[PDB]
Amino acid sequence: SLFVRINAAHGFSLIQVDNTKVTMKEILLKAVKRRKGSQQYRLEKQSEPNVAVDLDSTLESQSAWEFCLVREN
Amino acid sequence: GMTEYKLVVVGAGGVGKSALTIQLIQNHFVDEYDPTIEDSYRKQVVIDGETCLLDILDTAGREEYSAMRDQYMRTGEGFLCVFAINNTKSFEDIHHYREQIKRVKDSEDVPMVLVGNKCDLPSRTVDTKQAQDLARSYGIPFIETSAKTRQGVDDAFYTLVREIRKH
Ligand SMILES: Nc1nc2c(ncn2[C@@H]2O[C@H](COP(=O)(O)OP(=O)(O)NP(=O)(O)O)[C@@H](O)[C@H]2O)c(=O)[nH]1
Ligand SMILES: [Mg+2]
């Protein structure tokens, strides 16, 4: 019922969040584990390229449901 | 250069749609069963001499997300209908998925492949005859796969691409 969309280079993933006060760090780790093999990766919001979303910040603090899985530099 | 084929994996929850997709994409099996909502993967593969890019869509087996079904069944070119050989009713749910595809696509002629997953399991509820006879009724190939041993995984996706080559 509560999911975020992670846009990657070779597809996208809908990641369900149990509660809306999750880290941006926990979301990133689940994103890399599903998109790629395991475990140099950052989240940016799709609307604004190169935001480098704060990993401490929660989803309530975020004003978006869509983020991009992009590699560092 | 590359022909693009858009594949959709449909079936009841827990039949192994994610396990089959993950096996062909990143080449390993996992027993976590992290339930799916929707995931897309693009992989470059060689099929019988033809280099092609595969657009794989992993759907949710839980009818709670059935709303998205009306939207993705209109996008893909072929459908990989998966049931569990140890789950009778997921095999029964195959008929529902086909009929929904046929009338979202508004076409009887839709490229598809029947997949019976989890070959490695010792106890079986659905015999090969039941799926084979159902396959001829639908006029589509039936492939038995095991995501845990990777048996039939490529075979099933490859046959779907071959079926999509209907003119
Ligand atoms: N022994 C065995 N277990 C399998 C096989 N394929 C999948 N499983 C197991 O079956 C369970 C469900 O697999 P999964 O791919 O997540 O199923 P799904 O069809 O994607 N489920 P959902 O639609 O709800 O997301 C997992 O525990 C997985 O390890 C297989 O070939 N053999
Ligand atoms: Mg799944």
Which residues, including other chains, have CB under 8 Å from residue B55's CB and lie 6 or more apart? B4, B5, B6, B7, B40, B42, B76
SS3 B21: helix
- State the SS3 of B48-112: CCEEEEEEEEECCCCHHHHHHHHHHCCCCCEEEEEEECCCHHHHHHHHHHHHHHHHHCCCCCCCE
A11:B42 CB<8 A? yes
CA atoms of A8 and A70, how far apart (whole Å): 7
CA atoms of A42 and A17, how far apart (whole Å): 18
CA atoms of B82 and B24, how far apart (whole Å): 15
Of B26, B39, B42, the CB nearest to A14: B39
Q: Residue B144 is inside which H or E element, if any?
A: strand B142-144
**Cβ contact B147:B157 at 8 Å:** no
- Residue B166's identity, in one-letter code, is K
Q: Where are the domains of chain B?
A: 4-167
Q: Residue B134 is inside which H or E element, if any?
A: helix B128-138
- Residue B26's identity, in one-letter code, is Q
CA atoms of B35 and B13, how far apart (whole Å): 8
Q: Report the CATH fold assignment for B4-167.
A: Rossmann fold (3.40.50)
CA atoms of A33 and B34, how far apart (whole Å): 11
A12:B39 CB<8 A? yes
Of A13, A36, A37, the CB nearest to B39: A13
Enumerate domains of chain A plus CATH numbers. 3-71 (3.10.20.90)
What is the sign of the dihedral through the CA atoms of A16, A38, A10 and B75? Answer: negative
Please tell me what resolution, in angstroms, this structure has: 2.7
> ∠ at Cα B104 (B103, B108), nearest 5°?
45
Q: Give which of A1, A2, A4, A14 to mutate to test B binding, by max B Cβ within 10 Å.
A: A14
Q: Which residues pair with B117 in a beta bridge?
A: B84
Q: What are phi and psi of B102, to 5 degrees?
A: -60, -30
What is the sign of the dihedral through the CA atoms of B124, B66, A16 and B79? Answer: positive
- From B44, which residue of chain A is nearest by alpha-carbon distance? A10
> ∠ at Cα B76 (B158, B84), nearest 5°?
60
| A18, two tokens | 């149990």
DSSP classification of residue B166: -
**Cβ contact B118:B19 at 8 Å:** no
Method: X-ray
| Atom of ligand 1 minimally distant from the CA of B30 | 29
